[PDB]
Design a protein around this ligand. Structure first.
Ligand SMILES: [Mg+2]
Ligand SMILES: [Mg+2]
Ligand SMILES: [Mg+2]
Ligand SMILES: [Mg+2]
Lengths: 433, 433
């Protein structure tokens, strides 16, 4: 089946090199590109960067491309494994690399191949990519996800005083993915106009994910601003709010979080305990239609995770907590630390393992939210991933910048392909299937 | 040949609906999408918008989609024309519309089919799109273009009070399109770092095309900031500057341009004559390595265009002046208004007319710079277009935002496919073929 595997470097949404893989069967070319990654990470699969700080300021991927072309490609072609044997191919590649974190050949070297194998596997069986993924997860039905649009940004990626990283809108009350795109985009455009008159035109420029980082003063104010745009758009009650706090970013240790971590040598006014933080979330959850908070505490502050999950009825999403890693996910389940997995395929490094992490979550009652990375490409694989895995929710950007629209556009195309069989997750985004 | 034509809505990179077309032949599915200008010159072919303020702030394209699905599709299929006859297909749709500006069906309806016909014609002849385009223009050789990256932004869509719209960098000194990419991205990252230290982190947010709009105070400083960045990256002497003034935006009416048009109720200190504008351009070209200025005067202020093209030896690009329109181009040639065409397929509305416009320009000694719109998609047609038309220059964004990288990445893929036959326009970007 596999007659040719070939890697090149392309440029990602942030202007940095990344790996793209072309793979050939008798049915044609199947192409996939790899989003940004870790490279340094205690528990992530490691993306291989060249590190030559005089080429591309250390971000080029010639080594990883070379690992595909001179190691993976001849080995997996010689194996005779077929592109319809996803697990056998993914296992074969992990064994060939032979390290826990895929750091011999690189996770970006393996994932590109695994993703293209998966595209080719579907063509081999004459089915769309999302249907093939569904069969690999043993779903008989698929579902269209609620989109979670990044809109307002804080944390270490903004000059404002906001410690919480990103605020998202979720059209859980749309009747279709089509209405959800309309709802997402009109609110975005209303938010953009508000921002233009309150903060000025330069506040209208966008970050990596296509959202805004105006000079908002506090986290509550971001929620209020989002709430007011939902209302100007006439969708109050059909849009809910998601949050990614990224609390590791301002954890001081000994149960202390600093909401003014971006002010150097500060007075300690905004240093507070974990439970003070938890109370802050519950105030937010009482005033605003918040349905999901990701990384509400530090990646290792289990105690605070378990108490918040126990105290709330909303989605609690592990990202830095779980890093798409079955071992970490198992701990978090054991401790009841959260109730939803953020799924970054390139964090584990293969399709099979990504499906396996989703299934481990689903087996223990968790939701799964499919996620982009900050450095995306025109690749839209995770559009088919979220539909095939029936998770009901994807975070893949503001409705702006085509590395984000490429995904939302591919879901629209899937919605159209499915006709009357096209269920939208809606209010059941947490446990749809 | 044509068995099905179906159009849909997708979202462009600015979060606005636009037209995507699927065309089918016995060779398969061929997909093309239509870009959109954030600001459109007055003589452009009619982009058809629904204009219902309640939906997508009037920007939905349901009528244009229906014009493909319910008029163009049944008619062109009935005609039995083949995707291999570009002109006759294009002529048939133009005649089906009946208007000069494509105002009955929409330029966005006709271009989507035209672009997809073109991709299907290439497949029909077993050749890459760039080769088919090249054949359609009677070119035997193709050339990779110098990329023109919009790094620094002013004008109506920036907040910084710079009147000139785009500042661009051109690695004319690169030895290959790959090195041009390495140079563009390395300069971009250095520029980002320069802006961060001097203007703050938020000044690193990007505009529509991935570039920056810091709070520069005068146009000279923008050019100074770029010079500094080119030196940081260690490429002074290999990188040249281009400019898109977009002068129709600050033209007062009777040979008076206002460089402070973005300051409301200003003093007249910055209002000046076309002749003083041209002198300013000359001082810039004397001090900085500017090789190209686009729309330096108003879209109908013919006399200043002719005076500047006479006085200078640099490239003078028509954009809003020519609107990719052979009739407007013919006027310009007669007045020797400029010496380069900005080619925007959706300004005219068909592949044939677009190719016609380039051929008329080439016949009269002009360059041709293929161009994106500010509202782009994941579509990468124009990457093959610039290669097949041998123009040697393309402006399709900063190396940031995947609606821009998609085009740059497609040229990298073509460069690899061309192999040892791959020629980079380099210093011959104005007249490479
Ligand atoms: Mg996160
Ligand atoms: Mg995000
Ligand atoms: Mg224009
Ligand atoms: Mg222009």
């Amino acid at each position: 089946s596999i007659t040719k595997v070939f890697a090149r470097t392309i440029f990602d949404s942030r202007g940095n090199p990344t790996v793209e893989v072309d793979l050939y069967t008798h049915k044609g070319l199947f192409r996939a590109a790899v989003p940004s990654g870790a490279s340094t990470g205690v528990h992530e699969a490691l993306e291989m960067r060249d590190g030559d700080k005089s080429k591309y300021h250390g971000k080029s991927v010639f080594k990883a491309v070379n690992n595909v072309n001179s190691i993976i490609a001849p080995e997996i072609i010689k194996s005779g494994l077929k592109v319809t044997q996803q697990k056998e191919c993914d296992d074969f590649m992990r064994k060939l690399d032979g390290t826990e974190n895929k750091s011999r050949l690189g996770a970006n070297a393996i994932l590109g191949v695994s993703l293209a194998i998966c595209k080719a596997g579907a063509a081999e069986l004459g089915i769309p990519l999302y249907r093939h993924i569904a069969n690999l997860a043993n779903y008989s039905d698929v579902i269209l996800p609620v989109p979670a649009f990044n809109v307002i940004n804080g944390g270490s990626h903004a000059g404002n005083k906001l410690a919480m990283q990103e605020f998202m809108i979720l059209p859980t009350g749309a009747s279709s993915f089509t209405e959800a795109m309309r709802m997402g985009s009109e609110v975005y455009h209303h938010l953009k106009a508000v921002i233009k008159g309150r903060f000025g035109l330069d506040a209208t420029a966008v970050g990596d994910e296509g959202g805004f980082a105006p000079n908002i003063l506090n986290n509550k104010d971001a929620l209020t601003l989002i709430q007011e745009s939902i209302e100007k758009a006439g969708y109050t009650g059909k849009i809910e709010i998601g949050m990614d706090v990224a609390a590791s970013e301002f954890y001081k240790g000994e149960n202390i979080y600093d909401l003014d971590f971006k002010t150097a040598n500060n007075d300690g006014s905004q240093k507070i305990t974990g439970d003070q933080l938890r109370d802050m979330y519950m105030e937010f959850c009482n005033e605003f239609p918040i349905v999901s908070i990701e990384d509400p505490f530090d990646q290792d502050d289990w105690e605070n995770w378990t108490k918040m999950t126990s105290a709330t009825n909303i989605q609690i999403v592990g990202d830095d907590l779980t890093v798409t890693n079955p071992k970490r996910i198992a701990t978090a389940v054991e401790k009841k630390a959260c109730n939803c997995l953020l799924l970054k395929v390139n964090q584990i490094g293969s399709v099979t393992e990504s499906i396996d992490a989703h299934l481990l979550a689903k087996k223990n009652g968790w939701g799964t939210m499919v996620s982009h990375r900050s450095g995306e490409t025109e690749d839209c694989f995770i559009a088919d991933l979220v539909v095939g895995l029936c998770t009901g929710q994807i975070k893949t950007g503001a409705p702006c910048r085509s590395e984000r629209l490429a995904k939302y556009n591919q879901i629209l195309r899937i919605e159209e392909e499915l006709g009357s069989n096209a269920k939208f997750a809606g209010k059941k985004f947490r446990k749809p299937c």
